[PDB]
Amino acid sequence: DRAITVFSPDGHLFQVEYAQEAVKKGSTAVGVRGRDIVVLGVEKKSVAKLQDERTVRKICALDDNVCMAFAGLTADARIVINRARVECQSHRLTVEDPVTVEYITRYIASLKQRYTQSNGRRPFGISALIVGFDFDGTPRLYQTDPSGTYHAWKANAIGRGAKSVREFLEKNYTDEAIETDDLTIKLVIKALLEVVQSGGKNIELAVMRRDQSLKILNPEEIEKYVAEIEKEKEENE
Amino acid sequence: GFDRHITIFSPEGRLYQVEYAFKAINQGGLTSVAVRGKDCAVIVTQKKVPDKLLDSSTVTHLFKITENIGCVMTGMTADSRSQVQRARYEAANWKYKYGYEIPVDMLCKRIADISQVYTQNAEMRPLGCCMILIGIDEEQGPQVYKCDPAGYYCGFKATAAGVKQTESTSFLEKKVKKKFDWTFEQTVETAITCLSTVLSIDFKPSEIEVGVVTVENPKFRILTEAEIDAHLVALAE
Amino acid sequence: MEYLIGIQGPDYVLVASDRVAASNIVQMKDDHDKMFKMSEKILLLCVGEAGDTVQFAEYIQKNVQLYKMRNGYELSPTAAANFTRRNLADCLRSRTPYHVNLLLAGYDEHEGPALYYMDYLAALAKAPFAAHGYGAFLTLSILDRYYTPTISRERAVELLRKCLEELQKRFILNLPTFSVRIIDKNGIHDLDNISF
Amino acid sequence: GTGYDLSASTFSPDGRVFQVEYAMKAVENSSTAIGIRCKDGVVFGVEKLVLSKLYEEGSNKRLFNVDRHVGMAVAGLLADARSLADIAREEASNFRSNFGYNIPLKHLADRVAMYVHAYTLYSAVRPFGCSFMLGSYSVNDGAQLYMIDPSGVSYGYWGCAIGKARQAAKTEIEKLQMKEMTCRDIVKEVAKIIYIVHDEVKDKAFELELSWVGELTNGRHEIVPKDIREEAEKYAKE
Amino acid sequence: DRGVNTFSPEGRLFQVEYAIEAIKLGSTAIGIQTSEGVCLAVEKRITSPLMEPSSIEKIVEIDAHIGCAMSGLIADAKTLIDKARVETQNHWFTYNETMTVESVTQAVSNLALQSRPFGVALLFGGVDEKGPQLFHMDPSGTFVQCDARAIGSASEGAQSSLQEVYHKSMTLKEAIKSSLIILKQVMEEKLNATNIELATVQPGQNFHMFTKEELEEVIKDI
Amino acid sequence: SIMSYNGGAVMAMKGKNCVAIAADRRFGIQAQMVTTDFQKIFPMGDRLYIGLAGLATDVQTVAQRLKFRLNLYELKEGRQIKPYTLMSMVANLLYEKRFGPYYTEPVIAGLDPKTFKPFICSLDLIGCPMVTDDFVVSGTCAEQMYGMCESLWEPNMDPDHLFETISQAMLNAVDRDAVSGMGVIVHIIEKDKITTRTLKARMD
Amino acid sequence: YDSRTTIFSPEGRLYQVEYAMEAIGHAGTCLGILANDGVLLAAERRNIHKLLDEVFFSEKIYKLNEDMACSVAGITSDANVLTNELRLIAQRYLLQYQEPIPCEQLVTALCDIKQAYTQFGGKRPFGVSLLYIGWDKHYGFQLYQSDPSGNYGGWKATCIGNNSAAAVSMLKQDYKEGEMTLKSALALAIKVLNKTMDVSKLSAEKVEIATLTRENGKTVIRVLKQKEVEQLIKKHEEEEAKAEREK
Amino acid sequence: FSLTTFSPSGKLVQIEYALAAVAGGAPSVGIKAANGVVLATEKKQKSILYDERSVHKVEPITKHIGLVYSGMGPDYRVLVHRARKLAQQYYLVYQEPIPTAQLVQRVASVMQEYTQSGGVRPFGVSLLICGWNEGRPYLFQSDPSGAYFAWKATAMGKNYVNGKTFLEKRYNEDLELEDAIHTAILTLKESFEGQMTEDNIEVGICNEAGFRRLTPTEVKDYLAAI
Amino acid sequence: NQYDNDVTVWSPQGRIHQIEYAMEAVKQGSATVGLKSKTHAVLVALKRAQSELAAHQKKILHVDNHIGISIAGLTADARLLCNFMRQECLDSRFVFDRPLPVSRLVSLIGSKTQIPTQRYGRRPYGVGLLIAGYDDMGPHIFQTCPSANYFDCRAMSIGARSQSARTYLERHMSEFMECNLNELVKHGLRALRETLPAEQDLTTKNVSIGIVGKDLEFTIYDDDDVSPFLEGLEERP
């Protein structure tokens, strides 16, 4: 019938709905709060022997205290990061205080809403999600639907297999299991590990320790944390 | 589809819109004849006047674009007047930009370029009017040219446009194949007898309007009733 | 009427700047800082007309930070200096030229320390040493007299104290304190502010 | 038909513009009009349907004053007719501002016809649904009268009619002997012709809007005094 | 038909009859304008516990004396609320006084249809010189003064209940309880403090959040 | 005045199947010197150099913009620039800012890529080309280079003697002017080699 | 089902973009292999009609900057304008920063312009995918592959041609990182081109190859002319003959 | 939309229809000889009413660049006017290079406004370009959608297939002197229906001295003894 | 029906269909009457109410001290027309300090609304306007239809079931010039009351009155102000 940016006879916005269903094509993305550290992972499983793994860039920083991850179209996501990064540098230029996570998420949501508006612009079929420590200590996580909206979540769980991983997170999202940085990281694992095989090195985790720079976990330490998760799984017969 | 609805190339490799406009020239019920001679060029077209409530003073299809170039229009009258106005503007602009008067061939080229722009793009449509323009040109003698709704500007010696243009062109081809130059009596008589054989009404000296440009006498003379009557009497003798 | 100075050593750039901002009769901030941390190893000095210096220095700094965030690796000091000059020269011919006077310094892992000089016309130039302001006319001679291309950090601090003491002894406006920062391979190192 | 009579930019297979061929139908459907060039002037006349007595004295009149000496009698879609009348007024004002004096009727008619042709040439805009007569008089150029179709071009008319019944009016117009009759009897005769044209046979009562221009008014195209032309209406009734 | 501008063959252009029925997909919202003030009650309808309740907000204060409740596409409501804030601040800056809620609603209605039309309905409520007032603005650039309005997926049932539970001389204390019992009847789950937002309007108070999880004193009575 | 804001003195001369371009290496505001290694001779190719004199900022801006346009043209065509064509490109670039002119007086010195024909030309601030076969100069003290060259130049000169003459002229001119000097750079372009020399000059 | 470019699918796919990218596989053939001290491109000359003169000196391989070169594999109409825009971007960066543009930044700019073309407006997506080889100060020799979807990738051995699957399989089978050198990269490129081109004993005219090498502080992008290419062909033929006969 | 458009999955349907249109019926052969390039075409005017010295098929874009074309002549007029403007602009920017053959490749490249910005409806003319200001000749063809091809001998008429076959069988070759115009006329003869005459055949030649549209006298002289 | 899809396209049978559909916008609206007198102009509008809780909406909009309008139909592009008329009247005040005559304002409205009837992509202003004004020639009542063809009227009504009000006004229009203010207002109230079904009746809350006179500037009377006029209703539903 009609699949353009106009209201349908039953309501809704079918082009926006199609964009919102396009995130399913992509990859899983999990991340949590904890007042000590925000950690988010992607778990990409596609690397040929001839492609360099440096330029996958599934997680990227904005202002060394804000980082975002992919779920959906990669080119649209990269354009979003470029524009958002420009806007964070602008909001660092004016208003000399560093950017807040809510402000940049609001800007990203506003850009997505603007692109959904009018028939000319394709509605940016990317679902972004942003973590990071604010200026006033508190680390926060917001998840932005492609249409126009952002929501502050304790767990994001966006991408392929989003429903199952979100159910697992909300099932056992224990703050006592959050506590320490290591506990937080090991809670993100065994939750993202649940998605697909996750066997050798598929997990691609990211770390933001309060005021430290964006930490990308080394593969050997990732395997160490996987072994610790296995040890916790053991002795539970 | 819409191959035959808009100015786009057909799947067979043709352009149907201009092919329809050329027949639009045939629509309207009129004919014109242009004959170049040894020293002059004359154009005659019938003056179809339904009822005498019209002003035969202004029902003409021939006009003065400049002091030495005269056109005759075939097709829809509105597009004909628009193209006449455009030609007058082009002649004036050429005389302003370049001191010498605009050559008739250059004016035809500019009008044909405008028509080619019209058949280009899709917002506008070609003008359904074919213009035959004549004028004396130094170092060239009399000159006659035709600009069509497509943009192909050409034509010489004897050229006709209108509903029964094919028969007139055939008779003029027979006449020009007869190798004898036409003076400033034979050119006019040849044009008159051509248009009379095309439409046998004996041409009472009120239903045609002839324009003449000679070499010794420049300017586009719209010959009056007395002149056309005298030429008709001389021919029918 | 301000003061900027920079000295390029074998593996470092030592830069000092005055810490006064005034209103033509009176200084209102003895703690004014005009060091601009362009990146982890690039530092900028911008003196001149009020506000215009702040606007230009801030804009160039934020563009450099945007480049660092957008590529992961920071700009080379030479590239940063060339970009700064290009932007200033583009603004010069515009309706709103930036009457900013600059002194850009930085360290690179491959070419070592770097120091660049340019004026409100945006004429970039690389020099081992460069003083800037009304005090340049007073201290450039001391720099050229007591500078060798193999000056260590302690000797550089000694020469910088020499020229600052000359400025205090001979220059008209009081400059009670100066901010001293050194750029090297480890990054930006700030030294104790020199006062009198 | 079908896919060819959708936009004016689409030519017919035979080479015709069906959008204007349908715009002419609106003029053919709307009320008729008549304009006669008298010996020393031009006399207009239009019947107007009083669709309801709720309306006041004759409003949205088919007659318009486009310039000091020029008047326009229009028929068809009346809103676009008024817009085109405003266009003609602007054109006359611009010509007076640029070249001085008063705009010749032939040039004004040619310019407004070119503007109408520009509107019917493109695709986004649609052809005007109105046809009008432009009548004016001057001592130098006598009396002229040009009629413009919704897509055609201005033509010199000794006497013209447009609207619902063009042929029926034109028959009696050609029956009338112009070019030697003064504008007074021409007012009487245009009223007579309009009442000869059917008014209440299948419609409501009609009002008679008649216009004047000539040496008897020294140019200055104005509506005829209706109080003194009611007796002309009475003669037309007889 | 399908064109956003073409009129329907019968009486009224389409694609705006489609935009107006976007509160149907939106969540329920109810506001009561009494002599005491204006009570604005909405549901948050949290889908998962992990999402912070404070993040999901349907009632946002346009200014200190104007509160707005959205029902529909929150993305479009963000733009409309931002324009309302900008217009209110511009009016205050120009005239050094508090812009009337009717004027704000008029400006937002003007900006509603000027781009595919916005598909959100707003329930503005605030105090002015003409006592507390409440206005219902609809996606089709139309605003109407109302005393007790309901909007959302089940606007029909909530409005029908409000039509008979409301009386012209009520106070805030009765209005909040009536709105909450109606809400509990409309919704699927219960009216937990983490799921129900409430906004109060007072002549001598700015419009703040309803006690922020200490509002159970109003839901325990329910 | 304005053209003498930052000083500068650039020389170019013709030899026998060889060219020579020279320039001072001083940069500074009205009275002081800021650096003694400023670049005013820029290589547009293997056998083609340009010299700029005027405001140092305008020198660098013209050099960068010309390098940009020349690189674009070289990529578009794929054949090396002819010195006459590059002089034309400089002339157009200068004239594009007729009412905001870059206060520089560029000169062109180089050899044809195939015929190895020497070519030296000069341009004013607006961009008027002055192509000759003996020598052109630019800067604050252009009259001094003219006076020196009109007696030190000899047609059909070997590259060694051409270097000697250009060095003598530049050294004497930068000695007799008050704003330029403190080191002279000279480039000798032959059919197969480039000779870059830093002259022993009065550093004052 | 397809419509104006800026649409989606009921599932949520950009089927116009996917169709264009699949069409890129149709027609044209280029491959890039990255090795130490040299990275090279191999291109298949599609039309070898004897009535040409080969005066453009390059059809698939384009020199886009002093430190990089590309090879298109799409429609030539968009390929020409894309190469012009890429050269313009590189030279604009050179003007702004007075430094050769890093390859990743250049590729990101080009893929940004392609993403913009497929994002907004009623404009066709740029139906062309091109490789890039280049050298920079930060990462040294680099190879990148960009598709019309605007989603580039940092590769080290890839093909973009018609039999791109077969070519990349042959590469994966006979690719050895680290041990690879410029000469071994040439041998592998000629071998995989012979595999993907059905006619054995490929002529030097039907194959155009360019190698980027790092000289002393300067990047040299040499396109291998006919004699050198056919000498490589002869060496490859000797290797094939020895390998086949030694069994 | 407003550019070159209508490209479905793996196809350029509108471009393919434009290429079907440019099949035309005017051969307009071109031969790149060692000394220069010859562009010869057929002017088969309908009846004798039309004139041959009034309109021309070969147009000198500049001093030594000549141009011949194919179907859709009215489009060709605008295209050659644009080419003349572009060449003049290049010569004004890069002043006095006498740019013909160092421009022939460049002017062919700048034939991107020719098709890459189609103008809703793409041009329906394919044009052959000749230039010889480099010490060597050049023959290039630009089609309704592609770009420079750098031909040595080709035809673009109704019988362009058999014309090209005749060109290759007759060995366009490399040692051929400037007087390969005889072979060009013979190639036209294959795609010609009638006794070709001086006004019926229009040919322009571009040698190292420059470009020149041969007058009917020399055309008849060459046509004699054929 | 193809020819009814767009405003620009013309129906083969004559007048276009989109504008005919536009006149149905005023038909689908609350009724409103407006009548002239010797010295006063009065508008009686039916304030249609959504529900008993909500207000009866706003009709009889205010333009200037001497001009007031009543809308009927599509309320979206009706405040736009009100703003346009207010701006034009204030422009007249600002340029020559005189109240803009109602006829000139109505002509301006017609010209402004005519353009959307011819420009593609622009819907006609489907609003019926009952403009009441007092220029120097006494009171004036004008009706503006979306067809941009305005009318002058002694007494006209527009809205749903407005034909009965039209008939009543026509039958009683003879005794309209010689009527007191209250008498004319009661005539209008009787006309509007005859529009609604017998179940509905005039109330103070669902009616609005707009009166402009020689010494009385335009005033919008409602419930308390309407009650003196509503007395003596002579209720015959």
Curated annotation (Swiss-Prot), chain A:
One of its GO terms (molecular function) is identical protein binding. The modification N6-acetyllysine is found at residue 224. Phosphorylation by ABL1 or ABL2 leads to an inhibition of proteasomal activity and cell cycle transition blocks. GO terms for biological process: proteasome-mediated ubiquitin-dependent protein catabolic process. It comes from the Eukaryota. Coiled coil: none annotated. Its main location: cytoplasm. SMART domains: Proteasome_A_N. Induction: Down-regulated by the ribozyme Rz3'X. Up-regulated in colorectal cancer tissues. The modification Phosphotyrosine is found at residue 150. Pfam families: Proteasome, Proteasome_A_N. CDD domains: proteasome_alpha_type_7. InterPro entries: Ntn_hydrolases_N (IPR029055), Proteasome_alpha (IPR050115), Proteasome_alpha-type (IPR023332), Proteasome_asu_N (IPR000426), Proteasome_sua/b (IPR001353). It is found in: Cytoplasm; Nucleus. Keywords: Acetylation, Cytoplasm, Glycoprotein, Host-virus interaction, Nucleus, Phosphoprotein, Proteasome. GO terms for cellular component: cytoplasm; cytosol; extracellular exosome; nucleoplasm; nucleus; proteasome complex; proteasome core complex; proteasome core complex, alpha-subunit complex. Component of the 20S core proteasome complex involved in the proteolytic degradation of most intracellular proteins. This complex plays numerous essential roles within the cell by associating with different regulatory particles. Associated with two 19S regulatory particles, forms the 26S proteasome and thus participates in the ATP-dependent degradation of ubiquitinated proteins. Belongs to the peptidase T1A family. This is Proteasome subunit alpha type-7.
From Swiss-Prot, chain E:
The modification Phosphothreonine is found at residue 47. Component of the 20S core proteasome complex involved in the proteolytic degradation of most intracellular proteins. This complex plays numerous essential roles within the cell by associating with different regulatory particles. Associated with two 19S regulatory particles, forms the 26S proteasome and thus participates in the ATP-dependent degradation of ubiquitinated proteins. This is Proteasome subunit alpha type-5. SMART domains: Proteasome_A_N (SM00948). PANTHER family: PROTEASOME SUBUNIT ALPHA/BETA. The lineage of its organism: Eukaryota, Metazoa, Chordata, Craniata, Vertebrata. The 26S proteasome consists of a 20S proteasome core and two 19S regulatory subunits. The 20S proteasome core is a barrel-shaped complex made of 28 subunits that are arranged in four stacked rings. The two outer rings are each formed by seven alpha subunits, and the two inner rings are formed by seven beta subunits. The proteolytic activity is exerted by three beta-subunits PSMB5, PSMB6 and PSMB7. PSMA5 interacts directly with the PSMG1-PSMG2 heterodimer which promotes 20S proteasome assembly. Keywords: Acetylation, Cytoplasm, Glycoprotein, Nucleus, Phosphoprotein, Proteasome. Glycans are attached at residue 179.
Swiss-Prot record, chain F:
One of its GO terms (biological process) is proteasome-mediated ubiquitin-dependent protein catabolic process. Non-catalytic component of the 20S core proteasome complex involved in the proteolytic degradation of most intracellular proteins. This complex plays numerous essential roles within the cell by associating with different regulatory particles. Associated with two 19S regulatory particles, forms the 26S proteasome and thus participates in the ATP-dependent degradation of ubiquitinated proteins. Induction: Up-regulated in asthenozoospermic sperm. The 26S proteasome consists of a 20S proteasome core and two 19S regulatory subunits. The 20S proteasome core is a barrel-shaped complex made of 28 subunits that are arranged in four stacked rings. The two outer rings are each formed by seven alpha subunits, and the two inner rings are formed by seven beta subunits. The proteolytic activity is exerted by three beta-subunits PSMB5, PSMB6 and PSMB7. Disulfide bonds: none annotated. The modification N-acetylserine is found at residue 1. GO terms for cellular component: cytoplasm; cytosol; extracellular exosome; nucleoplasm; nucleus; proteasome complex; proteasome core complex; proteasome core complex, beta-subunit complex. Keywords: Acetylation, Cytoplasm, Host-virus interaction, Nucleus, Proteasome. The keyword Transit peptide does not apply. This is Proteasome subunit beta type-3. It is found in: Cytoplasm; Nucleus. It holds the Pfam family Proteasome. PROSITE patterns: PROTEASOME_BETA_1, PROTEASOME_BETA_2. The modification N6-acetyllysine is found at residue 76. The keyword Chaperone does not apply.
From Swiss-Prot, chain H:
The modification N6-acetyllysine is found at residues 63, 164. Phosphorylated on tyrosine residues; which may be important for nuclear import. InterPro entries: Ntn_hydrolases_N, Proteasome_alpha, Proteasome_alpha-type, Proteasome_asu_N, Proteasome_sua/b. The modification Phosphoserine is found at residues 7, 9. Keywords: Acetylation, Cytoplasm, Nucleus, Phosphoprotein, Proteasome. It is found in: Cytoplasm; Nucleus. Gene3D superfamilies: Glutamine Phosphoribosylpyrophosphate, subunit 1, domain 1. One of its GO terms (cellular component) is secretory granule lumen. The modification Phosphotyrosine is found at residues 17, 69, 114. GO terms for biological process: proteasome-mediated ubiquitin-dependent protein catabolic process; response to virus. It comes from the Eukaryota. Induction: Down-regulated by antioxidants BO-653 and probucol. Down-regulated in response to enterovirus 71 (EV71) infection (at protein level). Disulfide bonds: none annotated. Transmembrane segments: none annotated. Belongs to the peptidase T1A family. Component of the 20S core proteasome complex involved in the proteolytic degradation of most intracellular proteins. This complex plays numerous essential roles within the cell by associating with different regulatory particles. Associated with two 19S regulatory particles, forms the 26S proteasome and thus participates in the ATP-dependent degradation of ubiquitinated proteins. PANTHER family: PROTEASOME SUBUNIT ALPHA/BETA (PTHR11599). NCBIfam families: PRK03996.1 (NF003075). This is Proteasome subunit alpha type-2. The lineage of its organism: Eukaryota, Metazoa, Chordata, Craniata, Vertebrata.
